[PDB]
Amino acid sequence: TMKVINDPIHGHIELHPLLVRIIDTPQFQRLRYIKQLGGGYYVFPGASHNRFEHSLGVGYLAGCLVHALGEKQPELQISERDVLCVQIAGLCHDLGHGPFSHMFDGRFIPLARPEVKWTHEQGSVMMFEHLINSNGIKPVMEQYGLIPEEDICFIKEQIVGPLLWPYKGRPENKSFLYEIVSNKRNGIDVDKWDYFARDCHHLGIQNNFDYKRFIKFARVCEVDNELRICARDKEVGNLYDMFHTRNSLHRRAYQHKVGNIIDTMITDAFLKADDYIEITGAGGKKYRISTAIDDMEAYTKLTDNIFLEILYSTDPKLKDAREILKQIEYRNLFKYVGETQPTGQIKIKREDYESLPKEVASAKPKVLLDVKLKAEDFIVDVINMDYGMQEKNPIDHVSFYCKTAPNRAIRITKNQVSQLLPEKFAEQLIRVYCKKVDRKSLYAARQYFVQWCADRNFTKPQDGDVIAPLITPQKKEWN
Template sequence: MITNKKPTKIIQDAVHGIVEVEGLLMRFIDTPEFQRLRRLNQVGVTRYVYPVCTHTRFEHSLGTYHLTKRLLDAIQADLSNEVIRLTEGECTSLMLAALCHDLGKHEEISCRIIQRIVNKDEHLRTLLNDAGVDLDLVYALIRGHATPELKIISNSLNGNDVDKWDYIMRDSFHAGLGQGSCVIELERLLRFYRPAYHASDDSWHMSFRVSELENVMRVFTQRLRLRSSVYAHKTTLAIEAMFIDIFNALDPVLHLRDLSLRAATGDNSALDAFLRMDEHCIWGIASCYSIWPFKILPDMAENLRRSACLCERIQTRQLYSIVGCFYAVREIDVVNAQEPLEVDCEALTARKIVLMATLYDADKGQKNAIQREILGTESEILEEIFAKLPHNSPVRSVRELRLVSDLQSSNSTDDPPTFFVYRTLADTFSITQPLTKVCCFLLLWSGPFQDDEDGPPLHTPSPVPPCLTEALEAWRREKVEATALRWGKLTSKL
């Protein structure tokens, strides 16, 4: 157990209830860098579809810290596991990494922001040193480079970590898709998730008790539900495409991409500017063309006018029209999805083996999916579809088409996930799952562009022209047929 009760501040959280934060960590929270997270939405533009999804990365960071603290308390208090005992400094390092893991969204920027906070506060440096905090360990944890037994915040081996527990519970709560034990049996996860030794690779791994298999699988089924119903909702993707167009219009003016890259690679002035940017700031710049207080160069004026028009369209619900979708899979992902389940059959009941296999079945779109290798770039795909339109089509230019993609995966890992399980802490085994990945592409029509300021005002795009729907379907049929031979050859080898 984490000993030496320290003064704490009480924060009431909508998902976890009371969250206690130690004074040392409050010094990080009470900084402009951390408070900026209040102005960054946790689920992006989803709030335009699910109105209550207005929670921010601030709450998620507190929640991830809280779950890390509770899990560490449970591990340290477990008398049956005396081999691994973390020091107070290691525990505080883990909690600090959990609290600050999302400061910059990108891991490198998060680490640089922590360095910035520490470097400008001499007293904080003294407190960290007195508490035995290892900042190198904090950075390794955020980057996902921790040793297996410390993969609590980010687990690249199987995706089962406190970061995921919090955002799944939090996003489900705000989207109205369940709360508490209806989503995840959190109390059981905290009680039965422990570091255990596995002789198969002579390493310690965070492992769950065999009785918790269904509970762990619920984490991933709920993640898939959130992705299909919330994150990749068709209207969410259409609005995301409009925000990407806003970003592209602003980038030549604000150089946002270059700013982010320089902030991640050590440019302190770029990091200063990056930390002044948030969703409120970007929206204000994008939408205020008509009241812009400074002199605007002609080339900048066009970009700002276009971004302001798109902001107005979003607010008046004049969204891009959804034409249709198609699915694509890479050959390697088809092979991975067909891999047999590697499992200790003596350790699990037949019912649980079936559960492990069926939860990772291919997405419904994979059956008629296109082989990703035969597709070109996004611009090439759009050109091919546009070429199938008749000359009198209402779609005047390929610039009116957008293609957005969403990778639907059975896990957040890059490779087939390996879960580590124990009957007792001295009796362990592992399960390697097949990994299913299907990419959904959504074709959108923006409607005619307004290319000059004196042109007709933007309005809701007309219903999708039938010829555009037909062009997409004709293109898709060609690609499915072209895939058939490759697909047949592949499946015959499996």
Template sequence: MELRAEDDDDDPFIAQLSQIAHEPRVHVGEENAAATAYCAGRRSRGKTFNDPVHGHMYFNPKLCDVIDTPQMQRLRELKQLGTSYYVFPGAGHNRFEHSLGTCHLANTVFESIKRSAPRHGLGLTVEDKLCVQLAGLCHDMGHGPFSHVFDNEFLPLRHGWDPKVVAPWNHERMGVDMFSWCLDDNHIDLEPQVVRRVCDFITSNEEGAKEKRFLFDIIANKQNGIDVDKFEYLLRDSYQAGVRMSVDTMRLTSHMKVIDDRICFKSSEANNVYALFHSRASMHQSVYTHKKAKAVEYMVVDALVEADIAWNGRISNSIWSVEDFIAMDDTLLKQIEFCDDPALAKARDIVRRIRRRELYRFVNEYTVPEDQVVDFKPVEAKDITSCQGTNNIPGGLKPDDIIVQCLKIDYGQKGHKDPVENVRFFHYWDDETSCSIAKEQISSLLPRNFVHRVVRVFSRRREPEYIEATAQAFSNFQRRQLGKEAQITPVKRQRFSNDS
């Protein structure tokens, strides 16, 4: 017998509580014998979490089985914003609460698109709903210590991965492995097709999907990037960091429906869609890539590299085994700091410098000219040191003395594309036909380009002579590369001291 989503056995009263203050509201149908049989063998009651961002969130018993496992609870030890927490002290939230919120929003979107369709028109079932909820709950299980710092900075250094080639490991695939292990390790009984579909949702693998492809748009939307993962982290991160956003994600959720097997948005929300991508770019610029947070990030990477060498690759090789990987979290810095092993001396010193706020020094930055953004060639440390000229450093600046960050902030699409080109809309007078809307039809105030590049330079040494030499070399590099000094703060206006 086919079970439809309105036959779900969630407690009707509690399930409605989970949608308080959100549009659209979710009204779960009454229990029936078939739904009860479908969920036989699980705990009898679910749980309600009171969340500062979403209010009361209800999780059915099957979801609670997964929440109460070591694999899921590990996410309590992973800061959602990584090293940004060292700059924004209110942003101490973890990937655990983000995962709960993503699951909650996945359920909200599921109910929204079900309700916007003709009755039974989408053929949505209890299994569909469970798969979407589990994918939202478990999508971040594969993140390592300090999240993207581990993926993008530490692992390529230790394994020598070529940045131009797709890495042999990523947190999505590890998330699938951790989810499968979580079920086996904790004897959680799920149908094989449910496990397979959850794994496909986490990795956005649509190859085997013959129908209901729109369900892949909910958790990790590879078509245009509008998904509940983005909704959740923007809402939570901005709230915790004290940054205001201009997007109304709940309104987007209320004005979506499925047309031609894809999630589409009401045409009146086109400006709101742009606001979503603009909010993401603003968060990257002001929070995620804050220059002090990046300084801490580079120190954490250096500390982890030194510790990994001392521990014979225990950190970097943990990615090949879920049993080893579960022990990898942000507490690694504590382990390094309070370990007396002489081999950890360099790593321990870096961690203690972080504690004393003796960070790598941000020296300066410049914005890449608009006409050079598309064909931008990454700047390396040796490019800067080759322009140093004369200074007071014996032997001169060396590439290891500095760090160059080639920062790219965009609207979530590769290159410099407008992501809204891949968004489908519908008009209120014809909500059965999807269409695209050109940027020119929406507003003349929208951005002309959708990518922004900045080149930054940091000094690992805090002595004034090193910082001055780095600043001068950076200025010389700009004159050689751009024909002028493009940075906002000239060298002669800077003040260098060990206190800054």
């Protein structure tokens, strides 16, 4: 018999016994102890929510969309085997997030182990494998009409993409299934739909996107010898508004100036603690925080706990790390100086991130300073805001249909919709913070920053005339 569970976002979800069996494992219940928004909780006090319930919701919506397409179009021959596989993918899609979610794969691992190219998705695949094997799920999958050989590939492929037609999990006549959980084509997936609704509910922001409606106007059509999901022509407006809502949530919440500084501070503390924390892995081998990603039995035990483990410890080897975390409780955070963007089409490459603190200290502002500041005193945080496909417009990669010809797929350009849409679909934000908190050093930092902006032909800080009044007239372009 089905099991019913009450999510505050989606209401009463039914869970197929196979799903319940996957959910009730240490690998999945692990997600109860990892917050969705990482350090965001320390700015938005509503945002206590964890991956566990997000993972449930994504599984649910995956089920909704695939099941809806099947009702709408029997010709597709979507089996309850396909449905289950899509649900399972959705359910397990973020199994591989680290402590504090995106802080881990986005800040920490890149710093701790620059050699590796590792993502939360790759983790999810490996963790899924470990979940299946350590809990004897293969027999249960068979019991409910699945074929582990084919289907475990199909599930993995939904999550990370592919391990001519690149997929071994399903044929070309069911390519639409790959667009549900994690849409490689345009980015419109149920992952987004859940976290919009969920993050908004818990943050204290209202969500401007109706996933239910998009489902009612979704439909599979042939596009280039392949069956893919298409939206109705009228929905094009709502789809641009979906990616606006995404970018807006990043601006207000996910990339919040203090949320990000807390993320960097927690990352900093992890880096200092990494050497002295051991985690028992497979066959008892000892793994560090940074190396737990290599073994899943170890990574199973690596959660937000590691924060409090560091905070509460008395090991003097951890004193450096513990002091950073104590500074977060007391709220002696590194101080925000200002924000800026590049101009023209000057993209700042990732390689150069290391060097930018040096450049800020190196500026010679024509103003008398009390204090000189070294490059180690500065933090520069570079942030790429986009519409999910770097410089591309994702709507140019969406297929549409008309009321008059619902099997005929078409394209809608930007010009066909509106002149009030974005000109570009990607940019960079550069936040500068200063490690020295005091009145004297903050004034100095501001002068260095606003000069550095003029030095590199960046945009004038919004507060620029106030914070560095002596420096802003210098630039001819700012008048």
